[PDB]
Amino acid sequence: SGVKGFVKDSITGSGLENATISVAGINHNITTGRFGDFYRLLVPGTYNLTVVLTGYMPLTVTNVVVKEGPATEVDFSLRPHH
Amino acid sequence: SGVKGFVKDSITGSGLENATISVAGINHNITTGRFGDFYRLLVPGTYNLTVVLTGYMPLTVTNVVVKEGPATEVDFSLRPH
């Protein structure tokens, strides 16, 4: 279980590599892959996720809900500072 | 909640890459990007920061207060040895 999906540029729709995904209260980050893909493994619960990449506004999405069972599919669209 | 901002050179005003910010008591230090940017989540509280970069004088910033909500903005200026 956890949160799965893609981090993408909100302007182009391109998947963004090297974006850092943080979970509030948990000192363990992950980074997106070459297609913008990620899968953050978490036990079921509610979490606040922050996604950061140089050149983009930081994105915080609150109260994201991880269930028992399959990963919660969530994409994150990062806004360039531009 | 956390910290974000830039590390810059005190002479040029330009951003510094690969500076490290170490937060006392918190594992996993903070590294700056290409133009000096950094970001890290921290729970609300008060933190003591040390900023180092080989070839620069280290900087100590105490009593940095982190409140709920957006990251706390703070910049650091490093002087070249």
From Swiss-Prot, chain A:
Highly expressed in placenta, pancreas and hepatoma cells. Lower levels found in skeletal muscle, heart and colon carcinoma and melanoma cell lines. It is found in: Cell membrane. Glycans are attached at N18, N29, N48. It comes from the Eukaryota. Belongs to the peptidase M14 family. There are 3 carboxypeptidase-like domains. Only the first two domains seem to have kept a catalytic activity. This is Carboxypeptidase D. The chain holds residues 383 to 461 of 1380 of the full protein.
